[PDB]
């Protein structure tokens, strides 16, 4: 029972860390989109 | 009776889109274009004003 408890706690910790990493991966894009749209609007104004 | 469309000669085309070379960084075929200059870059207050090097292409 003690071994089971310790293993379960370790697995819970590992799974929590993995879930945190996965959520971080799946949840910079905004900044790049903003930069692209700013470049595009500046290009439009200069061309215009 | 028209200024012939500068479709043929690259020099004539650039002259038309540059307005006889008046345009510096833009080219246009539209006569109703509102002429604008490129906006001031956001980093000018942070990085100063860099000399824009024309792209080699």
Q: Give A44's contacts in chain B (Cβ within 8 Å).
A: 36
> Residue B24 CA to chain centroid, in angstroms?
4
- Report the greatest alpha carbon distance in chain B: 53
- Rounded alpha-carbon distances, angstroms, from residue B49 to A48, B9, B40: 23, 36, 9
What resolution in angstroms, rounded to 1 decimal?
4.7
Please give the C-alpha separations between residue A37 and each of A17, A33, A43, B47, B53, in angstroms, as whole numbers.
35, 6, 10, 21, 22
Gap between the Cα atoms of B23 and A46, Å rounded: 10
Distance CA A48, CA B37 (A): 8
Distance between CA atoms of residues B38 and A38, nearest Å:
11
Minimal CA–CA distance to B25: which of B33, B15, B37? B37
Verify whether the Cβ–Cβ distance A46 to B33 is below 8 Å.
no
Chain B positions touching A42 (Cβ under 8 A) are 38-39, 41
Of the partner residues B26, B39, B41, the one whose CB lies closest to the CB of residue A47: B26
Experimental technique used to determine this entry: cryo-EM
Cβ contact (<8 Å) for B28 and A46? no
Cα–Cα dist B36/A47, whole Å: 7
User: Where do we find the tokens 């408890």?
Assistant: A5
**Are A48 and B35 spatial neighbours (Cβ–Cβ below 8 Å)?**
yes
For residues B41 and B27, give the distance between their C-alpha atoms in angstroms, rounded to a whole number.
Answer: 21
CA atoms of A28 and B31, how far apart (whole Å): 39
Residue A32 is encoded by which pair of tokens?
């790049």
């Amino acid at each position: 029972i003690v071994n089971l408890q310790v293993e379960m706690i370790k697995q819970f910790h590992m799974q929590l860390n993995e879930m945190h990493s996965l959520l971080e991966r799946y949840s910079e894009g905004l900044v790049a989109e903003i930069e692209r749209l700013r470049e595009e609007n500046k290009r439009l104004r200069a061309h215009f | 009776f028209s200024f012939g469309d500068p479709c043929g000669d690259r020099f004539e085309r650039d002259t038309r889109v540059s307005l006889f070379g008046a345009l510096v960084h833009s080219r246009t075929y539209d006569m109703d274009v509102r002429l604008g200059l490129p906006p001031v870059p956001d980093n000018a207050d942070l990085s100063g004003l860099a000399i824009k090097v024309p792209p080699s292409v």
